[PDB]
C-alpha cells in the first residue's frame, strides 16, 4: 500500500477491552474509614460512559484488600489477545501510593504490577489505563484568585512499565474532593468530557479538559474554616508511547 | 573530695520539669477521623502518674494542628533553667512520623525540633521525653504462640542528643486502645512507673512496659482482620545518660 504512520495505539481489535470499576463505599468499622457518600453516582456514570465507548464493564462493590488483589490477579491472567486496551477505575479512600480496601490498604504498585509488560503478555504494547479517585495525602489547595546510532541491540524490548497511564483525581500529596450529592469532582468531569469529546480528541487532550474543568468549576464549601474554599487539580501521569483515540477508521 | 561519677542525668534541680499531655479525643468531622474512646482514661492516669513523680503537669484537650505547634513553640521558649527534664505525652491518631491534630496532621519532627539542643538552650543536656500513643501505620501483628588524634577546639553535643521517644507500637503498625480500659501502652506505662520509678532506671522501666504490652494484651474483634492481634512498643533512645526519677 501507500505511506503509513504508527503514532496511535491500534484500537480496532474485536473488543475495546475490559473496564473494571472498583467502587468502595462502606468500610469495616475497625478501620475507622468514613462511608464515601456520592460514590455510587460516580460508579453509575462511569459504567454508562464506558459502556458507550464499547468497553466490557464490570462493577465491583466494597472489596476487601484481599479481594482487590485477587480480582486484579485474575483479570491479569485472562486472555486479552482480542482486546485493544485495559481500563481500571478505583473509587476509594487513599493516601500517596495506596488505595483502601474495605478492611485496609492496598499498594497501588502491587495492583498495577500484574499488568506489567512481562507479566500480562496479552496486554503488552496495549494501553493500560488506571483512573483513580482517592486521596493522595492530606494537603489542601487554597487556590489563587484570577552509520547512525551506535547500537540497535540484538533484541527489540520495551520497558515493562511502558504503556501505563494513571489519571489521578488530585495532585500528589493532596486530598481529593467528593460531593455527597453530585459525585466526585474528578469523575463527574471525566465522564462529561469523555461524552463530549471521545469521538474527536486524543485522550491526553480529553484529560487536559478534565484538568481545566476541575480546576476552574469546583471549589469546596464547608462550615469548617480548615476545609472551606479549597481547590483541586488532577494529575495525568503518562507512560504511554502512542496517542490514544477511543474511535477508529 | 572523693571520687565522682556522672553516668546519670542530674535530676535534683529545683523542679522535675513540665509534663505536657496533649489529649486528642474528638476530631473535626471533615477529617473523617474517629473519636478515640478510652483516651480520657489514659490522660487521667498519666496526670496522676506524673504528678506523683513531681512533674508540673499541663493537660490540653482536642488541639488543632495549629494549636499543637503553637503550644510546643511557646513551651520551648519558656525558661527551663530550674527544671531537670521535659516530658511531652501525645495521645491521638497518627501514622509514621505524624501525630493528628483535630483538623489534620502534624509532623512529629516539627514538634520535637523546637526542643533541639540549639533551639531550647535551657533544656540543652537535659532529657527530653516524648511519649506517643498513636498509630504508626496500618500493619497488624498476628503474634506467635509460645591518645585520640583530635579533642576539637569547642566541645559540642549533637542537637538531636538527649531525646527519647517512647512509642506505643513498632514502626509501620497500628497501636491498640481499649474503649473502656484505655490504651494498652499508656495503661502499662503508668502501672510500671507507679511500681518501679523509685528503683529502676527509665530504660529498664520501659522494657517492663514492653513485656507487659507484649504478653498481657491481645485484641478481640468480631472482624477477622482485626482479631487476635498483638503489640510491641518501641523505645527510641538518643539519651546520653541513665535516667532515674529519684535522686539523693
Amino acid at each position: 500500500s501507500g505511506i503509513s504512520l504508527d503514532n496511535s495505539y491500534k484500537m480496532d481489535y474485536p473488543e475495546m477491552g475490559l473496564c473494571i470499576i472498583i467502587n468502595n463505599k462502606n468500610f469495616h468499622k475497625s478501620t475507622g474509614m468514613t462511608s464515601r457518600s456520592g460514590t455510587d453516582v460516580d460508579a453509575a456514570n462511569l459504567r454508562e460512559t464506558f459502556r458507550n465507548l464499547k468497553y466490557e464493564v464490570r462493577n465491583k462493590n466494597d472489596l476487601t484488600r484481599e479481594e482487590i488483589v485477587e480480582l486484579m490477579r485474575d483479570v491479569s491472567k485472562e486472555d486479552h489477545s482480542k482486546r485493544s486496551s485495559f481500563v481500571c477505575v478505583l473509587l476509594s479512600h487513599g493516601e500517596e501510593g495506596i488505595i483502601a480496601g474495605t478492611n485496609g490498604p492496598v499498594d497501588l504498585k502491587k495492583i498495577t504490577n500484574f499488568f506489567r509488560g512481562d507479566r500480562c503478555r496479552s496486554l503488552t504494547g496495549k494501553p493500560k489505563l488506571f483512573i483513580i479517585q482517592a486521596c493522595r495525602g492530606t494537603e489542601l489547595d487554597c487556590g489563587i484568585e484570577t552509520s547512525g546510532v551506535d547500537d540497535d541491540m540484538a533484541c527489540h524490548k520495551i520497558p515493562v512499565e511502558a504503556d501505563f497511564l494513571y489519571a489521578y483525581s488530585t495532585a500528589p500529596g493532596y486530598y481529593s474532593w467528593r460531593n455527597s450529592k453530585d459525585g466526585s469532582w474528578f469523575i463527574q468531569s471525566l465522564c462529561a468530557m469523555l461524552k463530549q469529546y471521545a469521538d474527536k480528541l486524543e485522550f491526553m487532550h480529553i484529560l487536559t479538559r478534565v484538568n481545566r474543568k476541575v480546576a476552574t468549576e469546583f471549589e469546596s464549601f464547608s462550615f469548617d474554616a480548615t476545609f472551606h474554599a479549597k481547590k483541586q487539580i488532577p494529575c495525568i501521569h503518562s507512560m504511554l508511547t502512542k496517542e490514544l483515540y477511543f474511535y477508529h477508521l | 573530695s572523693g571520687i565522682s561519677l556522672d553516668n546519670s542525668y542530674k535530676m535534683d534541680y529545683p523542679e522535675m520539669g513540665l509534663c505536657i499531655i496533649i489529649n486528642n479525643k474528638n476530631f473535626h468531622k471533615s477529617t473523617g477521623m474517629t473519636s478515640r474512646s478510652g483516651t480520657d482514661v489514659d490522660a487521667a492516669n498519666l496526670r496522676e502518674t506524673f504528678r506523683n513523680l513531681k512533674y508540673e503537669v499541663r493537660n490540653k484537650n482536642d488541639l488543632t494542628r495549629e494549636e499543637i505547634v503553637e503550644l510546643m513553640r511557646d513551651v520551648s521558649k519558656e525558661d527551663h533553667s530550674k527544671r531537670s527534664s521535659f516530658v511531652c505525652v501525645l495521645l491521638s491518631h497518627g501514622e509514621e512520623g505524624i501525630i493528628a491534630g483535630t483538623n489534620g496532621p502534624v509532623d512529629l519532627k516539627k514538634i520535637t525540633n523546637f526542643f533541639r539542643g540549639d533551639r531550647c538552650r535551657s533544656l540543652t543536656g537535659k532529657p527530653k521525653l516524648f511519649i506517643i500513643q498513636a498509630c504508626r501505620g496500618t500493619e497488624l501483628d498476628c503474634g506467635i504462640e509460645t591518645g585520640v588524634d583530635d579533642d576539637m577546639a569547642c566541645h559540642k553535643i549533637p542537637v538531636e542528643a538527649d531525646f527519647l521517644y517512647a512509642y506505643s507500637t513498632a514502626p509501620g503498625y497500628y497501636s491498640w486502645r481499649n474503649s473502656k480500659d484505655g490504651s494498652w501502652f499508656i495503661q502499662s506505662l503508668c502501672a510500671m512507673l507507679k511500681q518501679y520509678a523509685d528503683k529502676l532506671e527509665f530504660m529498664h522501666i520501659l522494657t517492663r512496659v514492653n513485656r507487659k504490652v507484649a504478653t498481657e494484651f491481645e485484641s478481640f474483634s468480631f472482624d477477622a482482620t482485626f482479631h487476635a492481634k498483638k503489640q510491641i512498643p518501641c523505645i527510641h533512645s538518643m539519651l546520653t545518660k541513665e535516667l532515674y526519677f529519684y535522686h539523693l
Binding site: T34, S169, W177, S180 | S30, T31, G32
Partner: peptide
C-alpha cells in the same frame, strides 16, 4: 463536599 467531603474528602476521600
Amino acid at each position: 463536599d467531603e474528602v476521600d
